[PDB]
Amino acid sequence: APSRNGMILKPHFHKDWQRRVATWFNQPARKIRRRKARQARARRIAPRPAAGPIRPIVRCPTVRYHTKVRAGRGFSLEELRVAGIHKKVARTIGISVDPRRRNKSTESLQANVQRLKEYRSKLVLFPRKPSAPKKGDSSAEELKLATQLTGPVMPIRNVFKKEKARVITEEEKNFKAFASLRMARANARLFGIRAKRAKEA
Amino acid sequence: PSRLRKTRKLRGHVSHGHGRIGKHRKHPGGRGNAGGMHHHRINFDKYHPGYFGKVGMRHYHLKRNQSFCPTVNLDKLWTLVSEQTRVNAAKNKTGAAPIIDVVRSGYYKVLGKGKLPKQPVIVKAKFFSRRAEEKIKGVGGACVLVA
Amino acid sequence: ALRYPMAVGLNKGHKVTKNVSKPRHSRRRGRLTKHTKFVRDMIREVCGFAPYERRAMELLKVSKDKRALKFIKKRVGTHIRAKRKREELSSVLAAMRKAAAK
Amino acid sequence: IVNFVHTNLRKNNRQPYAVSELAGHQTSAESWGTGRAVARIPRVRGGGTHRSGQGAFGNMCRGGRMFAPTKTWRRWHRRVNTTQKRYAICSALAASAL
Amino acid sequence: GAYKYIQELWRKKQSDVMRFLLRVRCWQYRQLSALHRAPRPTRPDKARRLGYKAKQGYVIYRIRVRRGGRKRPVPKGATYGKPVHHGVNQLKFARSLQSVAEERAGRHCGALRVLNSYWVGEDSTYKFFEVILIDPFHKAIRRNPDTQWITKPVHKHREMRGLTSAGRKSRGLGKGHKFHHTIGGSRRAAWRRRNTLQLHRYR
RNA sequence: CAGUAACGGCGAGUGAACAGGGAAGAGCCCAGCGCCGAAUCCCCGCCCCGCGGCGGGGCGCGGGAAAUGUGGCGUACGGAAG
RNA sequence: GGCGCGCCGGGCCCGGGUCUUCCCGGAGUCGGGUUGCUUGGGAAUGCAGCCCAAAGCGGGUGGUAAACUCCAUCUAAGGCU
RNA sequence: ACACGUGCGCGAGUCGGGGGCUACGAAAGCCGCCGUGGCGCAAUGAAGGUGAAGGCCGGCGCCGCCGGCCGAGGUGGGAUCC
Numbered sequence: 001a002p003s004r005n006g007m008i009l010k011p012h013f014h015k016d017w018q019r020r021v022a023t024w025f026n027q028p029a030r031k032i033r034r035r036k037a038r039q040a041r042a043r044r045i046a047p048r049p050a051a052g053p054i055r056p057i058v059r060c061p062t063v064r065y066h067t068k069v070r071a072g073r074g075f076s077l078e079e080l081r082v083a084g085i086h087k088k089v090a091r092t093i094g095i096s097v098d099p100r101r102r103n104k105s106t107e108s109l110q111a112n113v114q115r116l117k118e119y120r121s122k123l124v125l126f127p128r129k130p131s132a133p134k135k136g137d138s139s140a141e142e143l144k145l146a147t148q149l150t151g152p153v154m155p156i157r158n159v160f161k162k163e164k165a166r167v168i169t170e171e172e173k174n175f176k177a178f179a180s181l182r183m184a185r186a187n188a189r190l191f192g193i194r195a196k197r198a199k200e201a
Numbered sequence: 202p203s204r205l206r207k208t209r210k211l212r213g214h215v216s217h218g219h220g221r222i223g224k225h226r227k228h229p230g231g232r233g234n235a236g237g238m239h240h241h242r243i244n245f246d247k248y249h250p251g252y253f254g255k256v257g258m259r260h261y262h263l264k265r266n267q268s269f270c271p272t273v274n275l276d277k278l279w280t281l282v283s284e285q286t287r288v289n290a291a292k293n294k295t296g297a298a299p300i301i302d303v304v305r306s307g308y309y310k311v312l313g314k315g316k317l318p319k320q321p322v323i324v325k326a327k328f329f330s331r332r333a334e335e336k337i338k339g340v341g342g343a344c345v346l347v348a
Numbered sequence: 349a350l351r352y353p354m355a356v357g358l359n360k361g362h363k364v365t366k367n368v369s370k371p372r373h374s375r376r377r378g379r380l381t382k383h384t385k386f387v388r389d390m391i392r393e394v395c396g397f398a399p400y401e402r403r404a405m406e407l408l409k410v411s412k413d414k415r416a417l418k419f420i421k422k423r424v425g426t427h428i429r430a431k432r433k434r435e436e437l438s439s440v441l442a443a444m445r446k447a448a449a450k
Numbered sequence: 451i452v453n454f455v456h457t458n459l460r461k462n463n464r465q466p467y468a469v470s471e472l473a474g475h476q477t478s479a480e481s482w483g484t485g486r487a488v489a490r491i492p493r494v495r496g497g498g499t500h501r502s503g504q505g506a507f508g509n510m511c512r513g514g515r516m517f518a519p520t521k522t523w524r525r526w527h528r529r530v531n532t533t534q535k536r537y538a539i540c541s542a543l544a545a546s547a548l
Numbered sequence: 549g550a551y552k553y554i555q556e557l558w559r560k561k562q563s564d565v566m567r568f569l570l571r572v573r574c575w576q577y578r579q580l581s582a583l584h585r586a587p588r589p590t591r592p593d594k595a596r597r598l599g600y601k602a603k604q605g606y607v608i609y610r611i612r613v614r615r616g617g618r619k620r621p622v623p624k625g626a627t628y629g630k631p632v633h634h635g636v637n638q639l640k641f642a643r644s645l646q647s648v649a650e651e652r653a654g655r656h657c658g659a660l661r662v663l664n665s666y667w668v669g670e671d672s673t674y675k676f677f678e679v680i681l682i683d684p685f686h687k688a689i690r691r692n693p694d695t696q697w698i699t700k701p702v703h704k705h706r707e708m709r710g711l712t713s714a715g716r717k718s719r720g721l722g723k724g725h726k727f728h729h730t731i732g733g734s735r736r737a738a739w740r741r742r743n744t745l746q747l748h749r750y751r
Numbered sequence: 752c753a754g755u756a757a758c759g760g761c762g763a764g765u766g767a768a769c770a771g772g773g774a775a776g777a778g779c780c781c782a783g784c785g786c787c788g789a790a791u792c793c794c795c796g797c798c799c800c801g802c803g804g805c806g807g808g809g810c811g812c813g814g815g816a817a818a819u820g821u822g823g824c825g826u827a828c829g830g831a832a833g
Numbered sequence: 834g835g836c837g838c839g840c841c842g843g844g845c846c847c848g849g850g851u852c853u854u855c856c857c858g859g860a861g862u863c864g865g866g867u868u869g870c871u872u873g874g875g876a877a878u879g880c881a882g883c884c885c886a887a888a889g890c891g892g893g894u895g896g897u898a899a900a901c902u903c904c905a906u907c908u909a910a911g912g913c914u
Numbered sequence: 915a916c917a918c919g920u921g922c923g924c925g926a927g928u929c930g931g932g933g934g935c936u937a938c939g940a941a942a943g944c945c946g947c948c949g950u951g952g953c954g955c956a957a958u959g960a961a962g963g964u965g966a967a968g969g970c971c972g973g974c975g976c977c978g979c980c981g982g983c984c985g986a987g988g989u990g991g992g993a994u995c996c
Contacts, residue, residue, distance in 0.1 A: 001230025002241060005248045007916050008234065010764065010812070017745060023523050024749040028940040031933085034774065038934095052776075062770050063355070064265035067304055070771090077828060078369055086849075087828075091778080099828035102906090106367045118859065150935095155518060157947055160305050165297035166289060168321060168343045177329045177344035177349055184357030189962085191358055234763070255761060255959030261875065262725075262896040263756040266770055272956070272965080277926085309355070312956080314966055316986075327355045330965060346352035348362040373829035373857085377908050378891040381857065383784075384552070391556045398562030400886080424887050425865030427900070432888070439851090454922065463941045529750040529931065534923050535943090549784060550820090552858095559860050562886080570861095591818045595909055597782050597859045604793055617869080617882045638869050640881040657754050664911070667861060675861095688793055688816085694780065697913055713911070720871090720879045722909095725896065728768060729872060729879065742767075749940090750931055 042148065047126065053096045054119050056112045057156060069158045075112055077102035082109070083116040093123060094153075106152040118154060270328060273308040275336050276315025279323070281306040292319050298323045298342055311337075311344075400424075404437055413438070455538035458528035468522045474515025479506030554593040574669040577612065578675045583652055586610040590668045590678055598664035598713070601695075605686030607660055611668055612674040613645040636704050646714035647707070651677035653655060654707030660684075661698050662707040678704040 002008075012072030013151040042050040056079065074096030080087050090097045095116070103109045124146045203209065211217045230236065237245045238253065245252050278301060279287055298321035302343045303311055311324055313319035313332030323343040334344045353363045396404065400423045407416045413434060420430035420437075479492035483502070492507040509517035560566055572622040573590070586608045598642070600606055618641035620627065627633050641648070646665055660681035665711035667675045683689050685698040706712050710719055721730035732738045 002234070003917095004244075005917080008245075008249050008252065010234070010754075010916060013915095014764070015743060017743070020740070020744045021523050022744045022746050023466075024747070025522075025940075027749055027932095030774095032940085035313075036932085037775095038787080046947060047295050060771070062264065064266040064269040065771060068771090073776095078367075084850095096776095097225040097778095097828090100907095103367055103369065106366045107364060109367055110937095155947085161304065163297050163300045163302070165293075165295075166323065167295065167297050168323060168341075171350055172323075172345070173338075173341075174353065175343065176334070177352075178331045178334045178359075180346065180352070181329065181354065181356065184354055184360070185963085188356065189257075190356045190358070196277050232763090237762075253762080259757075259875070259897090260961095261757065261873095262768085264769060265752070265755080274956085274966090277955085280926090310965085312965060314956085316967090332966080346354050348353035348355050348360070367581070370828075372907095374827045374888060374908050375906095376890085377858075378825070378889045380889050380891080381784090381856090383856075384858090384889085387552050387556055390553065391560065395557070395560040395565055398886090400562070412554035422866085423885060425885080426887095429864070432891095436888090451922070459942075463939070465940075523745075523747045525751065527749045529929095531923055531929075531945095537923065550818095551783065553784080555859085559862090559887085561861060588819065593783090594859085596783095596820090599781070599912060601781095602817065602820060603791090617881085637868070638882090642868050642870080642880060644881070670861075686793080691793090694913090699873060705891095718880055719912090724894080725768075725874090726894090728874090731768085735871095735879090738767095748931065 029142065047124070047148060048094065049145045049153040051102065051149070051152045053091075053094045054115070054144065054153050055096050055156070056101075057108070069156055071152060071156050072096075072098075074098040076103055076109075078103050079109060079112040079116065082113045082126060083120075085116060085120075093125065099102055115154065117140075122154075270309045271307065272312050273303055273306065273309045274312050274314035275317045275333060278311065278315070278317065278322075281308075287318075287320075294322065300325055300345075302346055302347075303327070310318075313337075402432075405441065408434070408438055408441060440442060451534060452541050455530055455534055458530050459535075461526065461528045464481070464526045465525065466522045466526055467520060469516060469519040471519070473519065474513070475508065477501075477506035477513075485500050551593045551596060554591070558591065558594065559647070559742050570669050572672075574671050574676065576612065576670065577669060578674060580610070583609065583611040583656060586678060591666060594666045595678070595680060598666060600663065600680045601635050602699075605683040606663075607657070607681035607683065609679045609681060610668065610676060611649050611653050612676050612681055613649045613652075615645070615673050615675055616688070617641065617670065624729045626727075643710070643718040644714050645679050647710065647712065647718065649675070649677040649713060650712050651707040653681065653706075657681055658705075662704055662712050664712055705732060 038050075045052075054073075055071030055073075056075045058070045060068045060070055060199045061065055075083075075085075075090065075098075077087055077097070077099060079101075080095070080097065082092055085095060087097055087099075123138070124142050126143055126146075127134050133140075205301065207218065215221070217225070230240065235241070236341055260329055273281065281303065282299060282301050290299045300323040302325035303309075303324060307324070310328035310330070311326040311333045312330045313334070313336045317336050317340050319340050322337060324342070325345045325347045327342050327347050328339065329346075337344050354360055367430055388448050400420075404420050404423075407413075407419065417427075417430055417434055418438070420433050421427055424433055476496045477492070480495065481490045482488055482493050484490065486516040487505075489505075491511060493503045494501045494506050496502050504513075505511045506514060508514050553719065557566070561570060575689055588602075589600060589608050592602070595608065597693040598606065614701070618639055620636035622636060627634050627636065632705070632740055644698050646667070650662045650665045653665075654660070661684050665677045665679040666676070668678050682695065683700050684703075689695045707715060710716060719730060719734060721727055728738075729735055730738055732741060
């Protein structure tokens with residue numbers, strides 16, 4: 001029975017909820033387990049990056065996040081072809097591939113090609129047969145400076161470009177942002193019936 | 202801390218501070234929000250008006266991304282661009298207005314609440330209020346729409 | 349006159365140039381290859397037409413192609429598959445009507 | 451701050467203790483009824499041993515469970531503000547010169 | 549290619565040719581026992597798709613499942629509960645009759661392992677399914693790198709746990725807006741996580 | 752996200768998902784369509800190093816599987832051939 | 834047990850890019866009706882029974898039923914990890 | 915879980931709680947392009963949506979509007995201060 005002025009609430013505790021309580025005393029021991037399983041991974045892949053392969057510059061979808069840039073799944077096949085990268089040689093030298101990623105845009109396509117010119121120029125490749133050099137492999141001294149990269153390889157920072165201070169021209173001053181919004185709202189909406197009553201007459 | 206609690210002052214006292222006449226019985230008004238229309242009508246009317254009944258249109262697959270439009274006012278608009286710009290654009294004689302990209306700061310609409318200090322601005326915001334435009338134009342600046 | 353790029357309107361969204369590549373190989377899945385056309389061309393001559401189509405053939409012949417469409421809809425399910433079916437019953441009947449006189 | 455930050459951060463190295471769910475509820479008990487001159491407590495089902503008809507469930511019964519058995523999901527740990535943690539050390543270092 | 553000609557010939561089951569073949573075989577299959585070994589696949593073509601290679605060690609049974617819905621097994625139709633649970637007649641078993649067929653073949657031959665199954669005829673009383681079985685211990689399977697996955701003890705009774713094709717179609721999993729209730733491993737795994745107090749150490 | 756959209760004598764109560772931020776991160780194989788003298792596969796006998804996970808090699812107009820389709824190439828990211 | 838530099842045994846002798854002609858896919862199954870169960874899923878989210886039962890510029894999806902349009906996105910009814 | 919009171923810290927912010935980094939210690943310390951995200955800073959409408967001060971003084975006894983300095987009220991009671 002409710003006492004007085006006080007919030008209405010519906011506690012989700014009507015099931016046998018005590019049997020299925022997940023207590024987090026695993027947590028401090030889990031972080032030890034996940035860390036030892038991360039160092040011993042990195043110690044195996046001895047000169048390779050510890051985060052592993054390079055991820056592409058990728059826009060977030062759905063208009064809340066679409067001004068931000070992530071690390072995606074992997075590079076698209078139209079990003080590997082333009083870079084001169086073979087899709088199955090990509091995985092083996094530490095380049096992320098997914099066959100799924102479309103390309104609706106050229107700038108987001110071209111962003112991930114310049115991304116890969118960096119990597120192949122940054123790539124130190126050790127010969128499979130160590131004591132006999134092969135062609136595509138990097139020089140002897142580049143194998144000797146070879147260290148791991150702790151952190152995501154070519155880390156993705158969202159950068160807005162430097163706009164300067166401008167004297168506002170008599171045209172930009174004169175633009176009516178509110179009415180231009182309110183006009184286009186009606187032109188986006190009512191078009192359907194203005195196309196239909198014009199095809200009529 | 203159990204020692205600081207009330208149970209520690211109720212040892213010796215028979216009823217334990219829950220009445221001697223009306224005994225502390227388990228659920229004497231029903232479990233939870235029972236009798237909201239019947240025997241708790243007055244509590245649910247006096248403090249929770251509108252609780253019972255329907256209103257308006259159902260919208261089945263509603264995502265909170267399509268309806269995302271967070272607002273900055275013209276009050277705190279000069280906080281988004283550093284103190285170094287505001288003084289330089291005031292001090293300089295050329296009349297070059299510093300560009301305030303509102304989409305960069307995280308907001309998609311500029312509303313016109315505050316009194317904007319009298320130096321020209323350029324606002325690259327996505328949506329605008331009518332009053333928000335008038336103040337930017339009133340001081341003497343541009344309302345740049347952005348996609 | 350300046351038209352700024354807007355997040356709403358009849359031509360809205362961000363100013364981005366659009367590349368045009370060859371579409372991915374699964375988009376053309378279930379399009380009619382001539383080799384696979386011949387198999388259905390072969391088997392239709394072997395098997396015949398289903399007993400629901402024999403009623404559907406004999407009602408198109410009296411020019412009841414609505415009563416056919418209402419019938420084919422009931423048998424095959426939707427208004428969309430049935431209209432596609434009826435444009436394939438009449439096509440093989442207009443094929444017979446060439447052979448009917450000649 | 452020192453006698454608040456110390457008293458909450460020293461709860462964070464505290465291992466859980468609890469009484470088992472089964473502890474007390476491993477009998478097949480039932481109250482004899484309203485008659486029979488005994489106190490309506492869940493007595494143990496009949497036998498030729500000492501337990502047969504004693505009194506099984508309840509906090510007051512010999513054997514049995516405890517009232518409100520201690521749980522593993524007791525809020526053992528107390529998180530403090532990062533700022534207050536520094537404002538304890540700046541208050542601890544400051545008072546160990548004087 | 550011969551198989552594509554049999555492929556579309558099995559899609560005209562309504563035809564004069566296949567209203568005879570599915571009718572005279574559906575006669576034939578009732579007179580043989582409820583669960584017996586077929587000497588070959590009735591459909592070579594359909595078994596091709598479902599992974600049956602015609603080498604040594606691949607087994608095909610031809611089992612029948614009595615047709616219709618599952619009625620509630622209660623004495624004299626009395627269900628001792630609320631008017632909701634009174635139902636007995638018009639109830640439907642969660643798994644398909646095809647998956648019921650596989651886990652009778654798979655139950656019988658415990659030494660074998662169910663790969664998949666396919667339809668070969670229905671009556672008013674009996675659906676007939678050829679159930680494809682593989683020897684995990686015949687050295688033609690056991691030494692083939694692309695069929696040695698079945699031989700591991702992880703794939704013991706795929707038919708029972710519902711890891712065969714018809715077995716998976718009642719679990720209600722797959723991707724997207726339709727298959728939310730089986731996000732995670734299964735329906736039970738989804739239910740489990742969603743009904744756990746994640747009582748953290750701190751809060 | 753979220754006790755949110757939604758369900759419900761719309762009462763009691765029930766109640767996801769996407770995006771996002773992380774842990775890990777790995778990709779793939781057939782059938783079908785086609786080409787290669789079935790080019791494939793299991794088992795027995797004989798000997799040889801040799802194996803408390805019966806395996807590698809030779810050896811037989813020895814048997815069997817298999818054109819009602821075995822092996823290779825090849826699978827939606829396309830693929831084959833010249 | 835855990836791994837590379839050389840004696841070495843059998844097996845395997847393999848790739849890339851463009852131009853050019855050929856080829857390209859799983860059916861009592863999707864889908865539809867009706868029924869029962871399930872779901873947050875609401876003119877039916879998922880599952881099953883039964884009846885009807887397709888297509889190949891197709892098919893599914895596009896969270897309010899439908900008809901006509903455009904447009905987007907995957908490629909179901911086979912398998913592994 | 916909620917409401918209110920009270921104590922502490924910072925304050926248009928604030929909080930790592932999940933994650934990662936480095937005997938007691940499963941502790942503690944740290945990260946800020948780990949501040950996603952939570953609640954707060956904006957309300958309102960079923961919704962599409964919209965979304966929080968102005969007087970006068972000159973040009974065109976008056977006009978939309980070109981201007982123009984100025985400017986978050988008024989009243990009454992108000993602890994303190996002058």
